[PDB]
């Protein structure tokens, strides 16, 4: 059960050398075990008894499972002195992108790691030693002939080998999809179950051909398949049940795990909340610190248990059908979406953590949500979804058409499902005839942080205020704030504030400054505003 498979040319890193760390000592009880285990592999062909010619070595240990003694070789060192390979698939498939299959059979190619050969030129760096009863005469020397478990190259190499082998079958059976993942091969089809079964057996046999020994009936996996928090059934997918333990004492860790698992849930279940629980982490002094849950928290944690009792289910990808994506602004910065082909039958749902920045607007954020989604779709369905967005086209056209930055939204359609996104305000194109005119200004000693800010209008109104512990931007921005307060529904404000210039261009509706936020609230409350920038001094 070894293999007549080509080996891959493996080299070490840039001029380094095979590991040479001494063998951790063991008891007679642990030695006997390894010798046992080793003697079997020695014959199974996995390893070969060597000699002193090998200057390299690696630590082998003994750990029993749930009570037979199993062995463990520590390759950390080698792995360090091992060249690099091309990442062995770090991007795994998402259920929302699988097609439903009349059948899906899973073949186990477990020990396969120990079934494929190693680069005959490399096998020396894998050499390890089975000690003798407490540092007596030297022990038994071995070295791996097959891909060693826990070794850097093993995952990459295994998957490559398994690919060459599946090349033919796949080329010969187009109507069949196989998914290579570690020790598994999920093979699915739409052939009649008898046909399916027959083919499977054909595959198994072809494998048996290359020494990839056949599994057992006991170890056979069956639907529903558990995958990244999901339960994959033949006709649909569901969520692996998620339970919030009931406790009388909650530590910081417990509140963080809870928040952790809860957050991941906000992605599939609608209504999840963690705000009140998240307050529980303020001033926490130690992971094990016991934090008493507030009424708001106990209530929150309560509703959640109930939401999680919901049987959210989903559907699989049907290439014949449209890909629709509908988004909702669940709040400033927060967004939700659901990719579906036919109404109410979702492929995938999702939410995006309150995107908080230095200064943007909803439309801009809307756009970002859209792109993250499009990138997501491209990977999952190799195509972009038609978008149903809660924003009129006039709003979009108005925004995008003049915004200083390049932006875009693929084909999309409007859907009146409040709340809709809109432009809270629009600085006037030209100064306002009739409206008052404020000539604002703010000054502060960058060092004494003592400053003042005010304005003078073409109409006589004038104010000034002293501010302690302030910066120049603030004063200026404050200059603008008052102007906005002390003014009517139509104002003309002029300033030599460099920031007010960025505001004129971006016209944000949210930012890192409560102060700027204040200005915005006022900006929004206004009927007509004309911001003007003029050089300072």
Ligand X SMILES: CCOCn1c(SC2CCCCC2)c(C(C)C)c(=O)[nH]c1=O
Give the three-class secondary structure for 274: coil
Confirm or reject binding of residue 89 to another protein (CB under 8 A): yes
Asked if 473 interacts with another protein (CB under 8 A), we say no
Q: Which residues contact 172 (CB under 8 A, 6 or more apart)?
A: none
Nearest alpha-carbon partner for 375 in 63, 94, 83: 94
Under rule CB under 6 A, residue 151 binds ligand X: no
CB of 244 to ligand X, least distance (A): 26
Do the annotations mark residue 175 as ligand-binding? Answer: no
Half-sphere exposure of 388 (CA within 13 A, CB side): 17
- How far CA 474 is from CA of 178, 261, 361, in Å, comes to 61, 40, 21
Q: How far is CA 431 from CA 427, 428, 478, 493, 530, in A?
A: 10, 7, 21, 9, 6
Q: What is the dihedral of CA 14, 17, 18, 20, to 10 degrees?
A: -140
SS3 of residue 439 by DSSP: strand
229 binds another protein (CB under 8 A): no
Q: Which stretch binds another protein (CB under 8 A): 78-86, 134-142, 419-427, 507-515?
A: 78-86
| Residue 437 C-beta: closest distance to another protein, Å | 5
**Of 14, 179, 20, 178, nearest in space to 93 by CA:** 179
Q: Which is nearer to ligand X, 80 or 99 (CB)?
A: 99
Q: Please name which of 134, 138, 110, 142 lies closest in space to residue 34, comparing C-alpha atoms.
A: 142
224 secondary structure, DSSP code: S
State which of positions 202-261 bind ligand X (CB under 6 A): 223, 225, 227, 232, 234
Asked whether position 417 contacts another protein by CB under 8 A, the answer is no
Q: Between 187 and 391, name the residue whose CB sits nearer to ligand X.
A: 187
Structure tokens at 247: 């406790």
496 a known binding residue?
Answer: yes
How many angstroms separate the CA atoms of 61 and 26, rounded? 8
Contact partner, 492, from ligand X, another protein, none, Cβ < 5-8 Å per class: another protein
d(CA 168, CA 189): 17
Q: Per CB under 6 A, which of residues 80..119 are in contact with ligand X?
A: 93, 98-101, 104
380 binds ligand X (CB under 6 A): no
CB of 95 to ligand X, least distance (A): 7
13 binding partner (options another protein, ligand X, none; Cβ < 5 to 8 Å by kind) = none
Q: Tell me which residues touch another protein (CB under 8 A).
A: 8-11, 83-86, 88-89, 91-94, 97-98, 153, 156-157, 159-160, 163, 177, 179-180, 367-368, 371-372, 374-375, 378-384, 400-408, 430-433, 437, 439, 456-458, 492, 494, 501-502, 504-505, 530, 532-535
Q: Tell me which residues touch ligand X (CB under 6 A).
A: 93, 98-101, 104, 177, 179, 186-188, 223, 225, 227, 232, 234, 316
Residue set of the binding site for Mg(2+):
108, 183-184, 441, 476, 496
Residue set of the binding site:
108, 183-184, 441, 476, 496
């Amino acid at each position: 059960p070894i293999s007549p498979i080509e080996t891959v040319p493996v080299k070490l890193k840039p001029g380094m050398d095979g590991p040479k760390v001494k063998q951790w000592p063991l008891t007679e009880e642990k030695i006997k075990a390894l010798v046992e285990i080793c003697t079997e592999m020695e014959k199974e062909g996995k390893i070969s008894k060597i000699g002193p010619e090998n200057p390299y070595n690696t630590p082998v240990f003994a750990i029993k499972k749930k009570t037979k003694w199993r062995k463990l070789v520590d390759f950390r060192e080698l792995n360090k002195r091992t060249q690099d390979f091309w990442e062995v698939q770090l991007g795994i498939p998402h259920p929302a992108g699988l097609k439903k299959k009349k059948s899906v059979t899973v073949l186990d190619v477990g020990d396969a790691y120990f079934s494929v050969p190693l680069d005959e030129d490399f096998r020396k760096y894998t050499a390890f030693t089975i000690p003798s009863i407490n540092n007596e005469t030297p022990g038994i020397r071995y070295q791996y002939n097959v891909l060693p478990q826990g070794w850097k190259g093993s995952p990459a190499i295994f998957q490559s080998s398994m690919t060459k082998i599946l090349e033919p079958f796949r080329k010969q059976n187009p109507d069949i999809v196989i998914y290579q993942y570690m020790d598994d091969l999920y093979v699915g089809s739409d052939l009649e179950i008898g046909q399916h079964r027959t083919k499977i057996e054909e595959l198994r046999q072809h494998l048996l051909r290359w020494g990839l020994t056949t599994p057992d009936k006991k170890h056979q996996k069956e639907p529903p398949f558990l995958w990244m928090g999901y339960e994959l059934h033949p006709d649909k997918w569901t969520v692996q049940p998620i339970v919030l333990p009931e406790k009388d004492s909650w530590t910081v860790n417990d509140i963080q795990k809870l928040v952790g698992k809860l957050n991941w849930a906000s992605q599939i279940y609608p209504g999840i909340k963690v705000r009140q629980l998240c307050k529980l982490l303020r001033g926490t002094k130690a992971l094990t610190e016991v934090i008493p849950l507030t009424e708001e928290a106990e209530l929150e944690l309560a509703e959640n248990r109930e939401i999680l009792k919901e049987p959210v289910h989903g559907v699989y990808y049907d290439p014949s059908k449209d890909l629709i994506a509908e988004i909702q602004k669940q709040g400033q910065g927060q967004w939700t979406y659901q990719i579906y082909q036919e109404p109410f039958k979702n492929l995938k749902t999702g939410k995006y953590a309150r995107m908080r920045g230095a200064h943007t607007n909803d439309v801009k954020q809307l756009t970002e949500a859209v792109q993250k989604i499009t990138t997501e779709s491209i990977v999952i369905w190799g195509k972009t979804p038609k978008f149903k967005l809660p924003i009129q086209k006039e709003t979009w056209e108005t925004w995008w058409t003049e915004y200083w930055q390049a932006t875009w939204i693929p084909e999309w359609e409007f859907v009146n499902t409040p709340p809709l996104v809109k432009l809270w305000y629009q600085l006037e194109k030209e100064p306002i005839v009739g409206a008052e005119t404020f000539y604002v200004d703010g000054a502060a000693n960058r060092e004494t942080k003592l400053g003042k800010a005010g304005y003078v209008t073409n109409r006589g109104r004038q104010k000034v205020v002293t501010l302690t512990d302030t910066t120049n931007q603030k004063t200026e921005l404050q200059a603008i704030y008052l102007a906005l307060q002390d003014s009517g529904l139509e104002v003309n404000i002029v300033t030599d504030s460099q920031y007010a210039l960025g505001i004129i261009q971006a016209q944000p509706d949210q930012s890192e400054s409560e102060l700027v936020n204040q200005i915005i609230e006022q900006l929004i409350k206004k009927e007509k505003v004309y911001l003007a920038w003029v050089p300072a001094h």
